[model samples]
Target: AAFKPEELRQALMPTLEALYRQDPESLPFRQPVDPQLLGIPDYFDIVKNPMDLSTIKRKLDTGQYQEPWQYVDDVWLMFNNAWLYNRKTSRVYKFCSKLAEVFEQEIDPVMQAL
Candidate 1:
């Protein structure tokens, strides 16, 4: 597949925005996790590499993402971080888990047939 820089950004931008429209669960993922303010103490200790949609979007625009799969990684990381911190019984974990499933299916073929 052709790995064009601008094309990667262009392709990923809309996908990120589409995620925002599903605001119910995505609202929490829009920004970085505020461990201090949000009351999730030791968040950094548990999650070494925290990620979010806004950070992904920012990286997408600011050149942190130079490839398509990197987006996939961060998205997975974000969900995994949530899963690790919040228990399965917690709604936050359940929501992020569900959203993660949807996102993987949603983006599966986007760059594959290029």
Candidate 2:
């Protein structure tokens, strides 16, 4: 099962756009993490890698992700970082979890079709 590059590129956008649609107020999760704002100076020290929706959008637009799973991994990486960096009781953690769920919902249908 081979996927043409152009076909794969277009497949990524639908799910991404759906996620952005749900984030109308421009929540900070759509942007890169700010350790200064979190007041956790060593945030990056704990999370070896960081990912965000905007970053993935940029990468997808730039044709930087070579495979479908790479894009999927980036989505999880972003949410997983939030899951690990924040405590279970934190508001930030709850939204991140919900967003991750939405991401899964949107991504699954598109991925299954592809």
Candidate 3:
């Protein structure tokens, strides 16, 4: 099954916390690096545009890269932001639902026509 945004977030939160706490040899070993530290809305924004499907799909679909895990990575970052802000922000959730809704609009019409 495809990943849900919440699922993606839950998976990555541990890594983010580990990275933030300066755990040894994290995949991304930078300092905690808060979003405000970078003058950005969130730390995830560093990889946000890259993590977006529209931005990365050509590489993913073409097999130009391996793993193609940015969607999961980006959702993880968004989850961290929501956690930090102490409220439920639906950026990732809404993005997931919006994509599904748009896909259904196109696919449902085409199926009925068929």
Candidate 4:
């Protein structure tokens, strides 16, 4: 089954809100670095672009990717890889880590059940 953006967003609220409430100063970690510097594309932006469902369907039909959720997972992996490679120095590292936790604990289970 395909993922729903609204459901994903709604389910992510707690993690997202917690991330938003996090203070950089309180953490021992340094400021986040740019994903671009690590050669990571801005997939977050790409996934947000309004495009035809047909375009995605074609990709899905061709097995270009497994599913829409897979695309999101891939993006997260890419970002995580970059973060780890840089020793978690990015200012957004903590937030990204939290997101990963949310995916593992919340999103993935729901997605898998579907």
Candidate 5:
């Protein structure tokens, strides 16, 4: 169930290359952002509470919420809300379109696999 180190190395290489190509001046060549250091629970405790499917179904049936396909919709919404807020206030707004494109094309798929 754990990811192999080789798999992480392969997945990150393209992203590192893209970052280096984009801005060798600003990007740290020796330092890599460790995906292992990224903590979802540190930011939010969504997993502390188990999914209550009956509550989710009730909300869905009552027209109080949509996207009932997943019982973890609340968790998805929490992250999405944070992202939207960050986009408004963070340097994410200043990032180059090309970098964004590379992230979407190269890095996002790797993250999805994880």
Candidate 6:
């Protein structure tokens, strides 16, 4: 299907606004990412590897990870992961794996549905 330029622009207006609001430059991620260039593969990797326990522990121990801020980071990444998945064509295994890491839970039901 093809869309007229004006129609496409109109449809994307709200999405663009949302993206602008949530963009890394605007809101930033837990780890400081550029959402303007974000893609499905990137989302998959983030999902498959939310944050290494060792890395998190090290960061926390070294004052690199702060309270409330780290929590905010986690929430930010989670939202990014969800948004990317919902908007992209992703493999079920990869999607579930990534969702599990982001949300920290088994995604068997989701995988099964796929």
lDDT of 5 at 61: 43
Q: Give the TM-score of candidate 1.
A: 0.88
Write one digit per residue (lDDT tens) for candidate 4, span 1-114.
Answer: 654555544444443344234454213222233347646576344434322223323333445553446545543543454355434756445655654564466545545644
**After TM-score superposition, what is the CA distance of residue 83 in candidate 5 from its true location, in Å?**
11
Error of model 3, residue 114, in angstroms: 20
Q: What 10-residue stretch in candidate 1 is worst by lDDT?
A: 105-114
List the candidate 2 regions with Cα displacement exceeding 4 Å: 24-26
Candidate 5 least-lDDT 10 residues: 25-34
Please, what are the lDDT tens digits per residue for candidate 3 over residues 1-114? 354445444443443343234322222223243457647575454444223333223333444333215533443443343344433344434433444344334434433432
User: Lowest summed-lDDT stretch of 10 residues in model 3?
Assistant: 22-31
Winner on TM-score between 2 and 6 is: 2
lDDT of 2 by residue, 1-114 (tens): 766667887998988876666653227568888889868889889888988888988998887877789999998888788888889978778777777778888888888887
lDDT of 3 at 83: 43
Per-residue lDDT tens digits for candidate 1, residues 1-114, read: 556777788877766776766758787788899988988788899999989988888888887776788887888899889999888988788779767766866687676643
Query: lDDT values of the candidates?
Result: 0.80, 0.80, 0.38, 0.44, 0.40, 0.39
Clashes of 4: 5
In model 1, where do residues sit more than 4 Å from their true spots? Answer: none
lDDT of 1: 0.80
lDDT of 5 by residue, 1-114 (tens): 544445544544554455436563223122322234654333334223332223333443444432222323442332343444335445432333334455457655656665
Better of 2 and 3 by lDDT: 2
**For each candidate, what TM-score against the reference?**
0.88, 0.86, 0.25, 0.36, 0.32, 0.25
Pairs that collide in candidate 2 are: none
Worst 10 residues of 6 by lDDT: 105-114
Candidate 6 CA-lDDT value: 0.39
Instruction: Let me know the TM-score candidate 5 reaches against the reference structure.
Output: 0.32
Q: Name the runs in model 5 displaced over 4 angstroms.
A: 23-93, 111-114
